[PDB]
Amino acid sequence: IIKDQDRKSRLMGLEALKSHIMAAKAVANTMKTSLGPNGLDKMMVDKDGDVTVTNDGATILSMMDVDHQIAKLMVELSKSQDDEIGDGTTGVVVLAGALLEEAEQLLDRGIHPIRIADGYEQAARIAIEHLDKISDSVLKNTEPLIQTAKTTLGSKVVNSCHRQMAEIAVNAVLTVADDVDFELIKVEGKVGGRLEDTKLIKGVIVDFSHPQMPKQVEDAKIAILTCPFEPFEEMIRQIKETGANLAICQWGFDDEANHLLLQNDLPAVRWVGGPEIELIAIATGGRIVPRFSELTAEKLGFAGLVKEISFGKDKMLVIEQCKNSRAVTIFIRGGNKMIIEEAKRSLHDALCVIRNLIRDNRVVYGGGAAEISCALAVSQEADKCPTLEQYAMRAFADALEVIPMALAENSGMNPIQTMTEVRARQVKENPALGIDCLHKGTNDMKHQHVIETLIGKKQQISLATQMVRMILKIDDIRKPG
Amino acid sequence: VNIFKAGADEERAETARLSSFIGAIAIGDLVKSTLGPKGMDKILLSSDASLMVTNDGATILKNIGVDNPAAKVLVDMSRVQDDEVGDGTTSVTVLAAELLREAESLIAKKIHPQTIIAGWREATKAARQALLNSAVDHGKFRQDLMNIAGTTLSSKLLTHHKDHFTKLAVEAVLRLKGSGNLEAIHVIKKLGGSLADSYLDEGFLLDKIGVNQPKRIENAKILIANTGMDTMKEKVERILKHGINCFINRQLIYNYPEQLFGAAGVMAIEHADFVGVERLALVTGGEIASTFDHPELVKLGSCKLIEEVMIGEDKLIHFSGVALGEACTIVLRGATQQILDEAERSLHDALCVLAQTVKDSRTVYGGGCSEMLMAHAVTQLASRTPGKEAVAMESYAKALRMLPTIIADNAGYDSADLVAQLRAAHSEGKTTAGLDMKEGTIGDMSVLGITESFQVKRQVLLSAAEAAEVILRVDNIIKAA
Amino acid sequence: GRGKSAYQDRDKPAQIRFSNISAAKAVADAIRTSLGPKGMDKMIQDGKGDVTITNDGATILKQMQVLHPAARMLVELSKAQDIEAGDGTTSVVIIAGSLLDSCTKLLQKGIHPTIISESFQKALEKGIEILTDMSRPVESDRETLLNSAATSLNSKVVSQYSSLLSPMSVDAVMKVIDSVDLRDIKIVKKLGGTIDDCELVEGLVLTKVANSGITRVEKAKIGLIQFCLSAILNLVKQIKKTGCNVLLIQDALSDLALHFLNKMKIMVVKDIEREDIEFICKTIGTKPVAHVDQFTADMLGSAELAEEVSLNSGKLIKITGCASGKTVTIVVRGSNKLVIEEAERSIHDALCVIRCLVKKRALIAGGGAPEIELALRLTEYSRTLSGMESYCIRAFADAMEVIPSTLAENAGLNPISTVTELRNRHAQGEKTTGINVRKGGISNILEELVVQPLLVSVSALTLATETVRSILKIDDVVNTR
């Protein structure tokens, strides 16, 4: 009788293939427009009447009414790509679609789904083999690093000052580099000033109480104190009988006590949040003591410099040059908190790309150059290996030409006529040549300084390949309700 | 097998762009009618059965329930162009629209959006440089000031008494001209008489609360107070300890404290409008205090003359002769209510343009004169820069010719003939060729004293252009059914 | 997608124009049949049931619920005319509906709206000037003031006492000739006796509650209070501290409060209509204090004698001898409300007429004389003014023939034929040349004793035209609702 109730949707046979094809191809065509510096932005206005002008695919799919399962999968590809390294969240999407777009072809020919995955798998395994071959292992190389970072801060809202963001990214990664740990990088964000003001501190930037107090303590003896100095001469005296020159109160601070401590020449900051008080103890080593009686001469921390600087009329306490600054600090200033959010996010990506690099000296060339080189390889390797997997590898390669073709598309130049000059100028002058969407045509990427980490492309092919493969194995989905 | 629930539209390809741009175009062509000193105001009606008859585009766009994302963009533009200068509000909106309509035109020509943006980017910047060669540089000539103010007050309801308000707006900007300070100019809108009864008070004006209290206190140290003097005797005492002769309470003052004020020779005034209490702290220098236990001898402002004159049978407290006479209060009197309110803002904006003259000593020529020059400039340039960029820059210029075109339409004078008459007579009469509605023919802009302020046009060209570019970068939005 | 939600109106060119003219005219046609001495009344039965059989366009337009604003406009005209001259309230609308229907004859041709509005203005500036310079500017003159009151009292149920009603009207105005303030002459009816007992008192006479209250205060000190006197002793005591011996409460009055006002010898009158409290404010000078608290000694008015006269078995609160006779009271007496209703109404007119005569010591002969007068000169004005205005103005003149055409109509005569006879007997005669609907044919209106103050015509022409001119510019108005 009635196996599946109403409110369902059962995809059997070519019905499952078709649905996914038209469903994905579409979602792949949507993001494809936002690819490259010429990417076309999108406005995602949910049901709350809120606008969402973003260039990132994950940010567009996270606000797009996705009801189809296949589409959701494409949403997990950009999300995964955006939760790991982030950069190229667009690629994986467009890439996945292309592959599927080609797959359908092989399908309508009578080629079974499973088989399609096979060829695409072998080809991909080889696509990387080549991409990891053309790479030019980058050098503590200050030159290349600052460059790669600029290739990630481009076409964004932080492009107006991608130089300052990259500079901070390089030093931040180089400092906490030992294998680089992204945890030893504290990204403090506060309103005030602009984007250009963003800096990096070799210590802890804890977000003074009295004025005349020493606005410049060299090798301070931080006296981490919790209990408030409220109801003042004897209480402040003991803090001066320990050797401490920098009092850090976690609670209140009576004015009377502030002036007395002033006469002693010891700058103090009252009302210091729990977290801050804890972090300061991890930076200088200072020990957190309860009452002002447990405060000895070994609970004092040592910071190379403690100066209160007004970062755009936003005066704050800076604790840098600590003994063991295991925790760095990247202060991102700026007016509209919205712009900064964009900067902080990009920074994340800028720092991750460096890390993937530092822990793997291998970089490729964007502009599709690599894609072209691969598409060519896979094709020839598809011939050196017959069997039905041959047509598969070929199709795979054809799907490796979309990225470039898209570039020419979003650039305005005829995608076809472009690939004409590309594939040509590419085989002649090595794959070091790609598509310059700025000059409309072909040109050596290595010279245009359009480089991209190997992990970017590397991972990109993977993610897209793995997901698409899954869907290919999906020929039936009984969803009740 | 379904990505969007039943009822989720999906604008794809042209349809998406066609819908997007048109939406803004409609809104742009709507307020377009209210162009030139001879437009057609709209009788808007909210949800509370309200009849709104205004010629100001901004206001019109702020009462219209915009249910379109793109359109809302115009609401912003008109909100910026209006909060900066005044008129032209309609211009920036309309122009921005026509561009998009010209965009969807090139799109139909298979011209990729990006290249379109590029063309406009060149054209706009090119046209900008041009507005410089024509922009006449002026310099305390109370003559031009009137010509500029008289052109800002026109195209409104005040056009009848624009001459009267011109002398006022200019007289205030010449007296308080130390660096263009519009924050020192208070606007007093009161009902009682025609608009020809409005004057300019050389000081702060804020339309007593005791017959026992000193009406006219020559030398009085104004003491601002927010909280009321009620729960009383200790209130009057403390205030007497600071040595004040003039008390200004924002809230209500009890009867008892009111008696001690008059008996102690301390003139007081309760229920003081916050807007009138805020400027007081900027006109006399009296620091506003919360409770009566906070103010002292430092919260006292210096005033040389605080009298109460029954102007037009109305008690007006004059605080003229403030420490920094660089602050006045133009009083406006209207018979009805809309007239008074419509005149107020009219002066506010009139003050803005003057603030632009005191800093931006650059002026242009209206009457579509400025645009026609642009249209002819960007054109020659278009032919210089080949590629799709040409048609773009070309279509940009032709889109700038619409300004005067509409200026002739709302005149009953055929535009088709005006465009030719103006464009041709512009290549012979230089940049001094502008449209003259009141004569139904092209006339000299400089000979008729018709000059706009640089800031105006500059903002528009820069605004619409770039803004539209982004609008053309979108090709898939999720709004509402 | 949607840019303009449903339910919202967006009156566009061809549509809105046609709409405003069509129904407006129709609306005019409605009361059009109620024009003339033999006009046609209409029984207006609203929802509730209140049946109103009136002939006055205003009394009709205000009794009818208008849906779209365009029609409401006419209601504003007849309503504005009913306050600026009283008579003519009917014509104004008719003429307006004629200009609209006439203008359209120009629109259909191709004439642009704004030009038409501009044209009509020229005819208005010239037109109005014609009626005036051609009117008969006689001497105020005490005599004429009595002739203007007599001709406005007869033809009614007050003609029986027109001789005694005319003077009172002249005296009432001579005491308010500040240029006459109708709202200064308050009328109070009091059933009983006869109309011949009408008396004009100098002071605001309202329409006692404290038995022990001074029902006759010599040197009173009027005191207005809005807030009710309930919980009481402290409230009454405070009233006797200001010296108030005549408390006039707008709200209710408690018994306990009455007893305290009866012991302090303070005449109190509770539940005083809001309209009354306002008149006592503009006549005695006593400021209507909101709360009994804010009441002070400076809110005390000046009353020479506030007694409780028993006018024909009626207890009214006479407050004559006010400070600043701008406020005259006419006690109308009549056996039945029916005869009193006529007296009051007819008197109202006798007042309105004297008001028009003073605002313009001229007077034009009705009967369609001034209409054909203008219609003639205007037709000649066109042939000399040139421009599209010609046609327009002519139609503006022909649109005047309606008044005289409608007169002969409501008289049974042949409108077309009769008018022509007038136009001929007009040129060959004088401006006094009109149509006598009572005899069937032309005749010397002035010699017939049928004159009308210029204000009547001026107001109509001025208002009507300005409006019609404006509406023409109503070709784009979104409702956004």
From Swiss-Prot, chain B:
Keyword Ubl conjugation among record annotations: yes
Query: Which Pfam family would be a valid example here?
Result: Cpn60_TCP1
| Domain of life, per lineage | Eukaryota
A Gene Ontology molecular function term of the record: ubiquitin protein ligase binding
A cellular component term from Gene Ontology for this protein is: cell body
> What keywords does the record list, in alphabetical order?
Acetylation, ATP-binding, Chaperone, Cytoplasm, Hydrolase, Isopeptide bond, Magnesium, Metal-binding, Nucleotide-binding, Phosphoprotein, Ubl conjugation
Tell me if Cytoplasm is a UniProt keyword of this record: yes
Subcellular compartments: Cytoplasm
List its EC numbers: 3.6.1.-
Q: What class of enzyme is it?
A: hydrolase
Which residues of this UniProt protein bind ADP? G36, G88, T89, T90, S91, S154, S155, G367, E452, K457
Q: For the modification Phosphoserine, which residues carry it? A: S50
Residues where ATP binds: G36, G88, T89, T90, E452, K457
| Annotated PROSITE patterns | TCP1_1 (PS00750), TCP1_2 (PS00751), TCP1_3 (PS00995)
Tell me which residues bear N6-acetyllysine.
K5, K140, K167
Report the catalytic activity.
Answer: ATP + H2O = ADP + phosphate + H(+)
Q: Where in the sequence is the signal peptide annotated?
A: none
UniProt: Mg(2+) binding residues: D87
InterPro entries referenced in this protein's UniProt entry, alphabetically: Chap_CCT_beta, Chaperone_TCP-1, Chaperonin_TCP-1_CS, Cpn60/GroEL/TCP-1, GroEL-like_apical_dom_sf, GROEL-like_equatorial_sf, TCP-1-like_intermed_sf, TCP-1_chaperonin
Q: Can you supply a Gene Ontology BP term from the record?
A: protein folding
PANTHER family from the UniProt entry: CHAPERONIN
Task: Cite the record's note on assembly.
Answer: Component of the chaperonin-containing T-complex (TRiC), a hexadecamer composed of two identical back-to-back stacked rings enclosing a protein folding chamber. Each ring is made up of eight different subunits: TCP1/CCT1, CCT2, CCT3, CCT4, CCT5, CCT6A/CCT6, CCT7, CCT8. Interacts with PACRG. Interacts with FLCN. Interacts with DLEC1. Interacts with SVEP1.
Q: So what family is this one in?
A: Belongs to the TCP-1 chaperonin family.
Function summary: Component of the chaperonin-containing T-complex (TRiC), a molecular chaperone complex that assists the folding of actin, tubulin and other proteins upon ATP hydrolysis. The TRiC complex mediates the folding of WRAP53/TCAB1, thereby regulating telomere maintenance. As part of the TRiC complex may play a role in the assembly of BBSome, a complex involved in ciliogenesis regulating transports vesicles to the cilia.
Q: What is this protein called?
A: T-complex protein 1 subunit beta
Swiss-Prot record, chain C:
State the compartments where it is located.
Answer: Cytoplasm; Melanosome; Cytoplasm, Cytoskeleton, Microtubule organizing center, Centrosome; Cytoplasm, Cytoskeleton, Cilium basal body
What keywords sit in the KW lines? Acetylation, ATP-binding, Cell projection, Chaperone, Cilium, Cytoplasm, Cytoskeleton, Hydrolase, Magnesium, Metal-binding, Methylation, Nucleotide-binding, Phosphoprotein
- Provide the protein name: T-complex protein 1 subunit delta
Residues that bind ATP: G36, G88, T89, K156
Instruction: Report any Pfam family annotated for this entry.
Output: Cpn60_TCP1
Entry keyword annotation includes Transit peptide: no
GO biological process: one example: protein folding
Quote the gene name from the UniProt entry: CCT4
InterPro entries, per the entry: Chap_CCT_delta, Chaperone_TCP-1, Chaperonin_TCP-1_CS, Cpn60/GroEL/TCP-1, GroEL-like_apical_dom_sf, GROEL-like_equatorial_sf, TCP-1-like_intermed_sf, TCP-1_chaperonin
Per UniProt, subunit arrangement is: Component of the chaperonin-containing T-complex (TRiC), a hexadecamer composed of two identical back-to-back stacked rings enclosing a protein folding chamber. Each ring is made up of eight different subunits: TCP1/CCT1, CCT2, CCT3, CCT4, CCT5, CCT6A/CCT6, CCT7, CCT8. Interacts with PACRG. Interacts with DNAAF4. Interacts with DLEC1.
- NCBIfam families this protein is in? chap_CCT_delta, thermosome_alpha, thermosome_beta
Look up and give the organism this protein is from: Bos taurus (Bovine)
